[model samples]
Structures are given as structure tokens and as C-alpha cells.
Target: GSSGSSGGEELLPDGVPEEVMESAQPVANEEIVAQLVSMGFSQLHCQKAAINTSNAGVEEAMNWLLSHMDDPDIDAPISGPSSG
Candidate 1:
């Protein structure tokens, strides 16, 4: 089976366009990290993902993580009382 197996670079997933990394600054990288931090991921995890996919930029890296927001193993309890 051909699953996004060609034409695109293997650096990041095919959904992420290449242009995003054309102008990623270290500051912007950190800012994106901060945003993901606010979303409940640890700074360490965020940093690891971003650096591992340096060619994908912070936005793409965060998007990649966001894609897995409901693994059951990582989803924490929502704040406030549950509406029954």
C-alpha cells in the first residue's frame, strides 16, 4: 500500500507544508512551545517534539501533538464539575 510514500520529504508528515519552516525563528519556536505548554503538555515533551521535528517548525510540531489529544492514556480530567 502507498501511504504518503513518495514526493514529499520524510522530515515531517505530508500534511505539514514545507513553507512553515522557511522562516522559523528561535523566538517563534519558543513561543509555539509556550502555547503547547498552555494546552497541558509538559515543557519537556513539547521541547522534545519540536526539536525532533525541527524541519516542521513549532506550529506543525504542536499540530502533530494536538492530533493525539485523545489517547485515553494522556487525557486528564476536565476542570470544574461535570454536567450530568
Candidate 2:
């Protein structure tokens, strides 16, 4: 798809600053990771969910975890002790 002489410039959404948008990356936090892990969620799952939810709300992260519960990549642990 070729346009006119203009090279075409990408634009950011309204009300969002360039600096904020550029810096708006999800980083792993020990607190959030720990919180979800304590909720019986796998560590890998918690990290991904936390990042997806922007580390804003536990409920949001929980919802993400619930939706992706069957993901094989996440290794959820058994709640009860091993019967020996």
C-alpha cells in the first residue's frame, strides 16, 4: 500500500503522552508475583497474568488466570498432600 509523497507518520492516542506511552511497559514486581502465587496460581502464570493486567488489580489478574486455567504452560500444583 503506497500513498502520496507523505511518508505517513504514526500517531499516538489522544490524552496519552509520548513519554508515558513509551515508558508504559509491564515489569515484574515481587509483591504482585507473590500475591498471585499465594492464590494457588503457578509462578509463570502469575507473572504473565500480572503483566497482562498491568499489575493494577488482583481481581483482574485472577480473572486472566481463570480464563487461561487450562494452559499447559502453567504448572499448577496440587492442593492436598501426596498420598504415600
Candidate 3:
């Protein structure tokens, strides 16, 4: 009598490169984060928003921060004059 046994390794999903998966993602600039903070926005909040917005520049980050001004995580007051 003889018994059959086989062991095999599994393939990676999608065959994506390990380097791609392990690579570090780009983060927003500290200068930009500091700028937003100077404008009264929370440091962490600004960092998150800036990173999400592609870290293009202060303008983009500011716009993102403005849209999220009402968010509970944000601590900045709305800047500019009121409509009323």
C-alpha cells in the first residue's frame, strides 16, 4: 500500500509586486501643515487634509480645510466676512 501527499505554496493575489505594497506613501509637507496651523487649523487635521488633497500646495490644503471647517475634528473658525 502507498499513500499520496503533496504540499504546495499559494500564489499572491493579483500578482502585484511586493515592493509596491511595501513602499512608503508620500506625506504632506510640514511647512504646509504649519501654515494651516498658523491660520488656526488643528495640526493633525491639517496634515490629514493636506495629504488627502495630494499635498499640492497651501491653496489646495486651505480649500480642503475650509470645506471641513464644520467637521468635529477641526478647531478653526471660518475666516472672512459673513453673507448677512
Candidate 4:
């Protein structure tokens, strides 16, 4: 219980229109994401971290997440190269 709420509740970006906000979650390295998740990272967090590394590997994904965990939007469902 060392960590409490560091920020306010997670909020959606400024868009209420019916579109692909929820559908545009980026693709990620499944193998590395699974590894990251096994190491206690959130699914979304691993996905964002893993994708940015572009299938680098589990070690790279871990490094990425560790380096960027302090980011406020670290786990935000962002988009990446489509069909890539």
C-alpha cells in the first residue's frame, strides 16, 4: 500500500463522437506482451511498450516499459503503424 492515487481518475480524450477511439488500439508483439504481462505489466502497458519496440523482443519490451513507466500516458491505448 505504499502507492496511492498519483493522479486523478483516468479520463478519455476530448471526443464523444462515435468513431474508432476504442478500436484503434495498436498491434503489439504477442510473445513479448505475454512475457511482459507475466512480469506483472498491464496488458495495455505491455502492448504500447512492445509495439514501440517493433517486435524487438521480450527484453527490449521490458526495458522500454521500465524506462517509460513514469509516463502519465504509459498505458494509454495509442495507435501505431497499421498493417505493418
Each prediction's whole-model lDDT (CA) = 0.54, 0.68, 0.71, 0.75
Total clashes, candidate 4? 0
* RMSD of every prediction: 14.9, 12.9, 14.3, 13.0
The number of the candidate with the highest lDDT is: 4
Model 2, which residues run further than 4 Å from truth?
1-24, 72-84
Candidate 4 structure quality by residue, lDDT tens digits, 1-84: 586657675756555537645654346788889889999998777887887787488887778888879996794557554331
Clash pairs, model 4 backbone: none
| Order of quality (TM-score) | 4, 3, 2, 1
Which scores greater on lDDT, model 1 or model 2?
Answer: 2
Worst 10 residues of 3 by lDDT: 75-84
Instruction: Summarize candidate 3's per-residue lDDT along 31-64 as a digit string, tens digits.
Output: 8889988888887767766875767887788788
**Residue 64 CA displacement from its true place in model 3, Å:** 0.7
What are the models' TM-scores?
Answer: 0.37, 0.53, 0.53, 0.58
**Candidate no. 3 TM-score:** 0.53
What's the best-to-worst order under lDDT?
A: 4, 3, 2, 1
Q: Pick the candidate with the highest TM-score.
A: 4
Off by over 4 Å in 4: 1-26, 79-84
Could you tell me which residue pairs clash in candidate 2? none
